[PDB]
Amino acid sequence: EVITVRVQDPRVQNEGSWNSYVDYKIFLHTNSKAFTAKTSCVRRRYREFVWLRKQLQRNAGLVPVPELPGKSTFFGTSDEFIEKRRQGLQHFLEKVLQSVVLLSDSQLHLFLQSQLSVPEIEACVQGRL
Amino acid sequence: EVITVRVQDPRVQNEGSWNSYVDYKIFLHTNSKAFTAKTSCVRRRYREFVWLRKQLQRNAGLVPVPELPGKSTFFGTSDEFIEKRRQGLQHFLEKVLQSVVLLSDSQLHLFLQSQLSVPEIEACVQG
Ligand SMILES: [Cl-]
Ligand SMILES: [Cl-]
Ligand SMILES: [Cl-]
Ligand code: NA
Ligand code: NA
């Protein structure tokens, strides 16, 4: 029944380049059978969370899905933007995990416990990987 | 101290005339000590929001102030255009007000809690 999630450690990938982006470490510790691993650590970027939230909104129960932190850049500093984003991503996952139809989602499990890309998850869930 | 802002009740002013326009009720309630009124209700039109943002962005320097909804009528109907505008205007104010960055801006206060026109605000703050 314990599922503890943390979002930490923003890092810049491909820094300086056309395709630079920030990603976040996601730690999960759980004794839940929802998950193949008791402990996992993966990195995900904001756009993958956007993909995730939309996938969760296809849930079979039509249950509402917690909000993500937004795209607003209205911050004195980039550090503040990233920290508020990090907090908001962690809060999002905490709340997702409290909803049984969302917690049990097979694509959530692939998001949290693998580093399959979004297209790779999409291929996996069609048996095309 | 929280600031609650709502943009509601779009209405057509001067309906059927050359100078017809839509405006919006801006309702604010706050326990923030800086505001002159705990609850205010003013009406503002889109062009006034455009004026406001320009003033706010000058104050912010290179910090990017929240975007306004645009002019392009990409929604299918006037009703949908106005409702999405209203939502966008509320979102703009929510983001503006939820940060400490612009809360000292004289123009913002007069926009929100007076029914001074834009020229009158400009005159007020210029002396
Ligand atoms: Cl971007
Ligand atoms: Cl497969
Ligand atoms: Cl009228
Ligand atoms: Na084990
Ligand atoms: Na209305």
From Swiss-Prot, chain A:
Family: Belongs to the sorting nexin family.
Domain PX: 2-118
Residues reported in the UniProt entry to bind a 1,2-diacyl-sn-glycero-3-phospho-(1D-myo-inositol-3-phosphate): R45, K71, R85
Coiled-coil stretches: none
Region (Important for membrane trafficking), start-end ranges: 121-125
UniProt-annotated location(s): Cell membrane; Endosome; Cytoplasm
Domain notes from UniProt: The PX domain mediates interaction with membranes enriched in phosphatidylinositol 3-phosphate.
Role this protein plays: Phosphoinositide-binding protein involved in protein sorting and membrane trafficking in endosomes. Regulates the levels of TRPV3 by promoting its trafficking from the cell membrane to lysosome for degradation.
Name under which the protein is recorded: Sorting nexin-11
Assembly notes: Monomer. Interacts with TRPV3; this interaction promotes TRPV3 trafficking from the cell membrane to lysosome for degradation.
Taxonomic source organism: Homo sapiens (Human)
Curated annotation (Swiss-Prot), chain B:
Annotated ranges, domain PX: 2-118
Transmembrane spans: none
Residue span of region Important for membrane trafficking: 121-125
Positions bound to a 1,2-diacyl-sn-glycero-3-phospho-(1D-myo-inositol-3-phosphate): R45, K71, R85
Disulfide bonds: none
Subunit structure as annotated in this protein's UniProt entry: Monomer. Interacts with TRPV3; this interaction promotes TRPV3 trafficking from the cell membrane to lysosome for degradation.
Domains (record comment): The PX domain mediates interaction with membranes enriched in phosphatidylinositol 3-phosphate.
Function text: Phosphoinositide-binding protein involved in protein sorting and membrane trafficking in endosomes. Regulates the levels of TRPV3 by promoting its trafficking from the cell membrane to lysosome for degradation.
Protein family (similarity comment): Belongs to the sorting nexin family.
Name this protein carries in UniProt: Sorting nexin-11
Naturally occurring in which organism (per UniProt): Homo sapiens (Human)
The encoding gene: SNX11
Full-protein residues shown: 15 to 141 of 270
